[PDB]
Design a protein around this ligand. Sequence first.
Ligand SMILES: CC(=O)c1c(C)[nH]c(-c2csc(N3CCNCC3)n2)c1CCC(C)C
Ligand SMILES: CC(=O)c1c(C)[nH]c(-c2csc(N3CCNCC3)n2)c1CCC(C)C
Length: 106
Amino acid sequence: SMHSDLTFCEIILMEMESHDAAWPFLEPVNPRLVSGYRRIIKNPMDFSTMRHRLSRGGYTSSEEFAADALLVFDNCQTFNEDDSEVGKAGHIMRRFFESRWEEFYQ
Ligand SMILES: CC(=O)c1c(C)[nH]c(-c2csc(N3CCNCC3)n2)c1CCC(C)C
Ligand SMILES: CC(=O)c1c(C)[nH]c(-c2csc(N3CCNCC3)n2)c1CCC(C)C
């Protein structure tokens, strides 16, 4: 399971999931709702996958956790136009994440 030293990451992820712009990213991108996603996006990521990975001990370090967070936002900007609803949400969430991360990494 998760080491207590990563509790700050668990909290950041909880706060991300609660954010008004998080709704696109809560669960894996759903083939029932959009086609051609995994054709393009070779490493899908979403907050529920991260939540389960963190809780089971699948992140040994905070850097591995942060890499998956950034993968959510990198995938979003690779697939979606910047002015689309999901594209805009990804930019909001990246800023929110990076602002929280910078409290710890400075
Ligand atoms: C392609 C993409 O990057 C997307 C991401 C990260 N999310 C979503 C999305 C949209 S609507 C929804 N849910 C989740 C589950 N609950 C119902 C609503 N997820 C997309 C598809 C965008 C567009 C093609 C509709
Ligand atoms: C239910 C669902 O599967 C959905 C699919 C495929 N797309 C969208 C979507 C994208 S953007 C937008 N709007 C609505 C009108 N006002 C705000 C912008 N709805 C949804 C609703 C999901 C909900 C979590 C927001």
